[PDB]
Amino acid sequence: NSVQPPVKLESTVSGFKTSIEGNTTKIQTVEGIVNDQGQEIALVQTELQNING
Amino acid sequence: NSVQPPVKLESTVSGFKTSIEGNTTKIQTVEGIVNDQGQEIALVQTELQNING
């Protein structure tokens, strides 16, 4: 087919990409919050080992 | 015509969608558990500070 159309995939591919990049940004926000919560848990376990200690 | 979707893509699009909505539900369950674990860590830090203090 000419160019890159006979194409009905822009809304589905931009939707999947916005939801995959949205899920990757939510995963980076959650990996951020889970590395922060992992540092906060490690500070809360270091505090809880200082508190338990 | 060019209206209803391409050659074959319901299993791949429902597969990607069930895996993207599944990843978004796992991310909403993990954002749920990480907002709950962030509330638990904030409760646990606030408790560790009501405690440290």
UniProtKB/TrEMBL annotation, chains A, B:
Q: Which domain of life is it from?
A: Viruses
Which protein are we looking at? Putative tail tip fiber protein
Species source reads Escherichia phage vB_EcoP_SU10
